[PDB]
Amino acid sequence: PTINQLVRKGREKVRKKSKVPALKGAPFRRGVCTVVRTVTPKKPNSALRKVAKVRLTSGYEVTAYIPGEGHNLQEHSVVLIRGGRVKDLPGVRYHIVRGVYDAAGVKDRKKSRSKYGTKKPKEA
Amino acid sequence: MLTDPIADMLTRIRNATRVYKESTDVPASRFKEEILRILAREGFIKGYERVDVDGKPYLRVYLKYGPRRQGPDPRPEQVIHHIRRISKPGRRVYVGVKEIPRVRRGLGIAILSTSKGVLTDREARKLGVGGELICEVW
Amino acid sequence: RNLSALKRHRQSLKRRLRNKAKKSAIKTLSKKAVQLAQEGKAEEALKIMRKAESLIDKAAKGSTLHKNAAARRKSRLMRKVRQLLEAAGAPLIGGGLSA
Amino acid sequence: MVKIRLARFGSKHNPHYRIVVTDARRKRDGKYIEKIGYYDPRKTTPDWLKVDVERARYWLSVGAQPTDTARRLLRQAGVFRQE
Amino acid sequence: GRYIGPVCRLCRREGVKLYLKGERCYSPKCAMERRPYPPGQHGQKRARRPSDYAVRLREKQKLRRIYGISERQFRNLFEEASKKKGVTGSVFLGLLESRLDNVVYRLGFAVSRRQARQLVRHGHITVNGRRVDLPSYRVRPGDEIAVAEKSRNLELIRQNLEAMKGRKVGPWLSLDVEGMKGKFLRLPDREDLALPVNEQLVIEFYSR
Amino acid sequence: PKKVLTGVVVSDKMQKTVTVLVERQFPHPLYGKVIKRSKKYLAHDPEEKYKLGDVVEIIESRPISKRKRFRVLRLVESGRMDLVEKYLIRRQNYQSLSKRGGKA
RNA sequence: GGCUAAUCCCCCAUGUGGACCCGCCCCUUGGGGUGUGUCCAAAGGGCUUUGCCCGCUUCCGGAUGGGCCCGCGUCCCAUCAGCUAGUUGGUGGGGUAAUGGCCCACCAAGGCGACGACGGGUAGCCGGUCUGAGAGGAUGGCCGGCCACAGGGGCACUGAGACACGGGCCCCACUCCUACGGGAGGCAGCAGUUAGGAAUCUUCCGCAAUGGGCGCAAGCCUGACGGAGCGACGCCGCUUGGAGGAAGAAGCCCUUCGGGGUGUAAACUCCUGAACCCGGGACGAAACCCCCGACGAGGGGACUGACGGUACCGGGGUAAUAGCGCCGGCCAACUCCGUGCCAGCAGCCGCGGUAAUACGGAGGGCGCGAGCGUUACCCGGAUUCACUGGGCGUAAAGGGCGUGUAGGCGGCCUGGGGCGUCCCAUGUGAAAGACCACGGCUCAACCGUGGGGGAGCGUGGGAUACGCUCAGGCUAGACG
């Protein structure tokens, strides 16, 4: 583009689009479980991914992954959503925070406990 | 039409040197002659001289090159490795004496046009003045 | 409740009434005069004008008219009056009028 | 009314005032008209009170009314001593 | 809390001797003696060609573990030595050597840098009279760094200042083994330190 | 200093007032080339002196009306519609480029 | 309805003076002077009471604060292109401290727009802040400057000043009292409650210090402020020990079963000694005031701290918290076991279907450490909106072609101008911050003092190569 053109029209600044309408552009949002289904992976992967429909306080109804070996989520369990998609589950854009509200932490988690919200086991 | 006489000249020069012409003509203009004066003094061109082509005034520009080389491609290194127009019509470029660039860490020059005449970046800095930034050579 | 400085409002009302009363007198006399000059009656037109002039400057004494508010009034008055008096006037009393 | 007073500029437990010429109505730590001195309450250094008496006298020259404490410091730097 | 944990293991990981214990780190036991390979189940296995990162990483870790300092504090010194005029590299080392706790070590009061840290900490140190218990305290040129009178009688201090008889001192220092005093003459220069370090890579590591 | 400006009278259609078209130049803040914008000022002409085509000097004054804070200081050079033309011709293209389109 | 004081209200006088009309002079928008006419002042109180103090009136001037006007700069969408009637100007007038359609009567028919009017959306603005090599991008919380608002809408009164958060009136919604006629309210002040939210504190101490209002003063008021409280929310500082100590315990892990690792780590020995105890105990405070002296300058004297018995000093004194992430590549850190496209991991590429350094545990390791890691968002990497610093034959990208408006751009020579452009001086560019220097708290964080730089704009002076303009000339472009 000519300098005179740049002067006329000028460059247009790029606009990033969110990937997490956890509304309020908040760090976390709490919702209520609706369905504790279990989806199947995509393209190659295969397994029974544990998922959950959630009715957010942000007015949105979303699907969220439930990390961890085993969970305890039910129909009307209160939960906290943290944002983060799952490559295999088309339609799941947030993870559920384990160790908050009704979602119990993972039992027998002796490693990356910070995630999977499990307290420090007392070494006998 | 001939949109930029000055740029036309730097190019004629860039073009001729790339094929190693000895001479090379460019339509004469007081201003263009002023520039060539520096080109010579700074040792970028053997020199130049007024001449008449088809009846009209021109400036012969005597090109200068390094010596012949070894190995394949014996073509001489250019004395004018670079020479780019800066201020141009519809994008004039002027600088204060504090903004006069330092071309090629000092090994190259920059020709300015000041109310004190056409000088090189060093000359300008001395005389403490600024002005349209005609070009850059190195 | 009760911020005993209600007294301020209490007093505002008085002052309001005191001012309001000065001004209406002012306006009344002002016309009164302008209208006399209007009809060409020299003497009484000025006689009244002087009162107007007086009330005005006194209004500016305390904080009723105050400032150039008084000045504006007088000029717009002496002006209107002397001009309307251009009907074979001849400012007799020449009161508020430097002949 | 224009005053000559102190302006808190220290920090917690480390107060440092600025003898200033401001309008009576500003925040104490607000925008002043001119600085004319400073005062270190705790004399933490040998130089705990400068006053530029030249300027002060100018401000007083035109209505500057000093806080009591400000005056007491101005006196120390002999802004009043008329010998 | 600065590290505090097995230390001759760092000596080993850097495959280079680190005097993190003053004494012993001489008596055929710094472990770097007949066991200079890194700690752990893999130490003896062959090492692979380190990545440019690995190299710059290892170099910084060295220079740093030498002064038993936290990355946090270490980094700030560096960013400080980056702004100030002069070859960042050495300027940085200058500041590292100006830590009161280091100086104490440098002046023989303590056998190690850790020990010195404690002597400074537990008050057993002085700086122009006034005592200073801040290990990160920056000693300037022209400061006397004496041992606390009350401690001049301490068994520990008498041993070290004893063996300190004869032992020379850095050309940027000087000490009066009598009154157990010493002075910080000037900021040491890169040449003054025989550090098995290449600040070149340390600067480059903070460049990334 | 009460700001003084120079422009052309592109309009004499009002009473005791004229429309002066002051031109201005400057370097684009980011692309540097010298661009040239322009603004119209309504200046006070009591004597109804200044006529369409006049180049005048405008002077910052005390408000005379709403949207009118300049008085015709003086005349710089009379007659020269070559300028009024540009202005008018430009107004003429407006007479389109909407649902129809501006001539040429 | 009646009584009554005053520094409350009024009339007359004095007129330094000031205001208005008119004339004139100097000035030049309504600035200053002058002459006649007119008009306009005042309050008292206190004593160490014939003097001093507090105060009153008119005018001029300073100082401070403010209103109004103007040049330039100030987001997105043109799937918003035409907008406008008090609308644009005029004359007379109202209102104001003052200009002005601010408002009104009458007159004219204007004003604005693609250099983006009008409309829709978003947003207090700035000093600064974050990021960035920079240009730039993002941002405007704490602190300071300005603006706006005070349950929503409108309005004026009183005042130097308000259209007035803790003043007034009306309408609206809501809450409360009601003998149902009618009343009372407005925490976007401090603290606190409740609701909403992922989420944000003590119904604390004090008026000692700084500042503010009234008072002659004593002093009163001050949720402003100075402090303490809670919260790793951030930054900085500090501890969990230091030295010695086996060719190397046990346990646990691996193994070619020889052995290797955890590891000087431990145990143990000696040294120092955070916490904690005992004693002393602060700066921040010197004025106001009293006394001498003229209620002045100056000298002396007394009172007063929330923090707090905290900081700090001295003595005594115990070895006395460590965690979190990661180890397939990017990326520093590898082995066994379990599992078997499962259970799970996942930022991207991807990993798991019987040998998985990628899942879970363990051992070992790497990083960082009272923190560590995640999520969200901004800048970077992204020269991936490219001014610095990109492109369009085939990768995304030349308009189907022309004619031509606006606009952008313009050969050679001379002269005038000096608008751009360059230089000098000067003014401004507040404080805070940023940078450098020195200094204060044991360091630092933090804070103090000083210095330097600063785009932009105002003013005066100067230069004239280039760009512009004006005048003149030329034929190499163009046209004939």
Ligand SMILES: [Zn+2]
């Ligand atoms: Zn060792």
